[PDB]
Amino acid sequence: VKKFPEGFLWGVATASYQIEGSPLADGAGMSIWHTFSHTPGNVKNGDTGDVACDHYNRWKEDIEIIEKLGVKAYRFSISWPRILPEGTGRVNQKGLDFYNRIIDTLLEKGITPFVTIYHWDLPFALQLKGGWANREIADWFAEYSRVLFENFGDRVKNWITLNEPWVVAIVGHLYGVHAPGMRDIYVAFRAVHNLLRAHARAVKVFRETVKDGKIGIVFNNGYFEPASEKEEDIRAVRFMHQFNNYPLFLNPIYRGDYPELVLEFAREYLPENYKDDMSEIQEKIDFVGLNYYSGHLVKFDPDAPAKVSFVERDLPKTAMGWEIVPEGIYWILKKVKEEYNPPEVYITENGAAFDDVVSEDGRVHDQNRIDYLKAHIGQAWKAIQEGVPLKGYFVWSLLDNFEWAEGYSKRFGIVYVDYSTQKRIVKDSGYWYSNVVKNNGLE
């Protein structure tokens, strides 16, 4: 029996573009994901978020599933261009109405909302002006955030500024695999920097506009291990942790500068005078959200960008090919405590894609996903016994949904969605997780 602390917050998570559909309904502006996915060759099978799970229309049924499973919290994101179709300026009242109904409904049902302000669907109007490459985005994001706070902050008390700024900057602007689909390392590092600047502006206006609220920010993380005991492999791991995991952003927030090995690799790409912005970047936050899915073996590789390469291991893998290493969620939780000692931490995403099917009995028996979640939840419990102030844990995702450049081919839900009919079928993992929440842990 692994019982969690009293009041621990068990949650499920989604993001706007991945579930909503109806990107241009009710006068909403285009986002960069609408334009990126409508560009041939960017997304597997030419999939787009045009329909997705049709949560734009089916939101009430989806919330009723959260209630039925007795899940305590719901992390979801708001689509910036539904609110400000031009990025700034004119507020779209129908966009407020859509999210107001969701928020009111969650409260009515005793479900705690955690709002992600930005989960990647930048208004296309702002991309035309350079998007995350433009220092002015700190002002644009501050405006958008204030709008959300003044409208929703009387009811929503738990907020997240950015989902995975490393991904937004590096996958979006260096690899070009996510919107806006660019490949320029100087632009990517300026994005990393402007994301931090925008985050800090949002937190500053939050303190002015929301009463009794908490605000945080969410990082992707992997558990990197050395391919050997050679010192250069151990160093490769340190560089991968500093660059790919929370330190890239938490070293600035808590210490006022980038990590040492990131500066070693990337000082050239950062704005000259970037450090002038650090004092404002250190705006105090209430909690750190960590996402965690996978572990990676890494080695020094003299002929690789940043002199590091991944090494494939013979470990169990999900349908993404991602290695399942549950102790990594323990490691990242312990390590964030040791390195930055944030007052509170949440696992804001953990979960897995598997090739789910509906069996002849009409149920979706996804035992692989149960076993994945069970092992990670036990490891999170271990971190708590060792003093990590973990306040909550959110499964990615409530629903199978649009998995970015992989399209609909990768299913992460605890609820299956048949995209031909939009029927929801709660998976075994959903009923299993319902029991975890009921027992406040594993038995």
Added chain:
Amino acid sequence: VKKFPEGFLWGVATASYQIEGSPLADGAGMSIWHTFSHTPGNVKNGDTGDVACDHYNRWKEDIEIIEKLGVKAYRFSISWPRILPEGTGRVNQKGLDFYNRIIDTLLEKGITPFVTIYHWDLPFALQLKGGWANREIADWFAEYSRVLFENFGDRVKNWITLNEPWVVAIVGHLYGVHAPGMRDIYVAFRAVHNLLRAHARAVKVFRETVKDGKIGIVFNNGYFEPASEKEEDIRAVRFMHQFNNYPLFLNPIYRGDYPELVLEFAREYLPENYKDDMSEIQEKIDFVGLNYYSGHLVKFDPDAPAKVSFVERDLPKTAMGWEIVPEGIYWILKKVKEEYNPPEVYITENGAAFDDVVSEDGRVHDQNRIDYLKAHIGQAWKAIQEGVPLKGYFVWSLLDNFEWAEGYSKRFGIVYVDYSTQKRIVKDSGYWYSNVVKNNGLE
């Protein structure tokens, strides 16, 4: 023999980023090609324009080659961020000095400069604000052009606003193969439209500043032919001509709208009120420059984007794998006259990459390149006999140089450059072309 008109201009062409090196010397700002080529994975072999042909230091020797060869015109481009390091605002004197010495030197030796204002090296500072995706670029570009007209317009009387706006827009923002490396079809067609607006705005400034000069614009073109007589193949060719050749830009300039078939395909991606800008885009131009390298067999293809695909043919190809179809140059010249009757036309590039070998005699026996140039010059001559107002022909390129995403691996020069020593070796095609110039044609 095929003698050209009296006063026919024989030239050679280069571009700033492809030959200069020293991208950051003397207060220059970064360009998007510096940051793109310094991003791993974007350019063959990790090649950059950091040194290139070192023309930044060797320009006098290179001009002396043009002089020794008897070539009468030199088309070269100016690096925008050498002149305005932040894209707008403060002018960099040393950048002006660099091009001034080039211009004075050409004029002392009786070589006519043709200046390309924009040959793809956008200031990086402007890319951070959206670059060609941002409407405001018409202003930025008009101001930059003004600075060049004011500083050099006393001496330079032949000007080109943009080199191959189709490539800038489509290859740089839809295929992501050139800087700034993006893949977004909405951004790409915004870029097309803003390039037209910037060009027209520059010509308007030109009329104010350089009263006795001529200005034009340069387009890429291929000679498209249908894979069969099926009607869908014939319509595919008409589409490829309207989209990939001069009509995309000349229909706006001469007729006040995009080509029919381009609108059919792309109205979604163009700004909704794009036609409001057409009157200004009609600003009168003095000449059209046409680039031409290859012919392509095309078919209707239901599975392809735009529903068109290229079909490989059994034809001689260059080391690029580009089909050698010299009658294509005749066709594009006849057709631009038939369709838009520009007052003056110039072939602003024609040339070929071959696997050049320096033999024991210290020479480069590129009969392949001679055969290519000769056939195209003969076809251009035929166009002239039939009434096309072709005023000059420029070989791409004077020098082997940095071939964009191909890096140094592809050599187009009539002069070989050994990059280890920066030694210049005139190729047999260079001696041959010198004779063409001396004879004013083919003998």
